[PDB]
Design a protein around this ligand. Structure first.
Ligand SMILES: CN(C)CCCOc1ccc(Nc2cc(-n3cnc4ccccc43)ncn2)nc1
Length: 277
């Protein structure tokens, strides 16, 4: 750790993230210092060192010395939240939205084939570079609830890869409309904003929903709205894909693999963003 010169704090993950410079090699890195280490965590983290993909932020090194754990990652120059904020007047161009969605689906398909879930996707942990890449960071082992799948909010203990597809669907919608789709500020507010837009789920659209730990018979019954109203700028292919990413039933929700084959991507390309660094 004496090996690293902290340049600036750039975020908060289970810890704070700094831009740092390796004092010996000259490498500029993102250094995550983890909040207070269990034998189980060390071994689980070391496996993530082998989960390498073009659309996953590269974990360069794990430094367990001595009670704290630091994760040394490759440095990317901007997060998607900042890029969306910087693009808010005109919006991110559709071709670039589509490229980013496709690449994140590639990252997830990879993670999910190895039975690794992200669990907390959000614009703040999606990182972009000047050559058009976007990468997943901060794979979990005031908290934002906006991207949380309904099965998590309803108390499902053993949720699936489908949670990440839900989160990515919410992020897709946001890139398109330039407003967060479900900006809840508590778990029930989040759940009711989902219900208000997509309809209160029942046994018809989600078999077993009424048996979920935090499901109440007394939830209000809202009707579903149209996706034409929810993401107006999006063409029918994007809306179709989005609707599949936001299916209530995690077993009907589209997989990352299947989503890559969606007709929305027939004309996918890799534009380069205009980034102000
Ligand atoms: C100073 N703030 C006003 C700026 C706001 C945020 O701006 C930036 C600019 C550049 C980067 N770069 C990164 C970050 C990561 N990373 C690894 N685990 C993470 C967990 C959370 C977030 C990022 C995480 N990995 C590689 N590159 N991250 C944020």
């Amino acid at each position: 750790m004496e090996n690293f010169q902290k340049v600036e704090k750039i975020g908060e993950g289970y810890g704070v993230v700094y831009k740092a410079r390796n004092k010996l090699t000259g490498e500029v890195v993102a250094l995550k210092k983890i909040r207070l280490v269990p034998s189980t965590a060390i071994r689980e983290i070391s496996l993530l060192k082998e989960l390498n993909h073009p659309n996953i932020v590269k974990l360069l090194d794990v430094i367990h010395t001595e009670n704290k754990l630091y994760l040394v990652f490759e440095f990317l120059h901007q997060d998607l939240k900042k890029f969306m904020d910087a693009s808010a007047l005109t919006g991110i161009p559709l071709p670039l939205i589509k490229s980013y969605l496709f690449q994140l689906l590639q990252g997830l398909a990879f993670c999910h084939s190895h039975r690794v879930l992200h669990r907390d996707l959000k614009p703040q942990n999606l990182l972009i570079n000047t050559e058009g890449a976007i990468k997943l960071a901060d794979f979990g082992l005031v908290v934002t609830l906006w991207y949380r799948a309904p099965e998590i909010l309803l108390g499902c203990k053993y949720y699936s890869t489908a949670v990440d597809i839900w989160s990515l669907g919410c992020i897709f919608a946001e890139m398109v409309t330039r407003r967060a789709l479900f900006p809840g500020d508590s778990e029930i507010d989040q759940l009711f904003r989902i219900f208000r837009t997509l309809g209160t789920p029942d046994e018809v659209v989600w078999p077993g929903v009424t048996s979920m730990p935090d499901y109440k018979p007394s939830f209000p019954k809202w009707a579903r709205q149209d996706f034409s109203k929810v993401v107006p700028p999006l063409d029918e292919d994007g809306r179709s894909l989005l609707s599949q990413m936001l299916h209530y039933d995690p077993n009907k929700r589209i997989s990352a693999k299947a989503a890559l084959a969606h007709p929305f991507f027939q004309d996918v390309t890799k534009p380069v963003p205009h980034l102000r660094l």
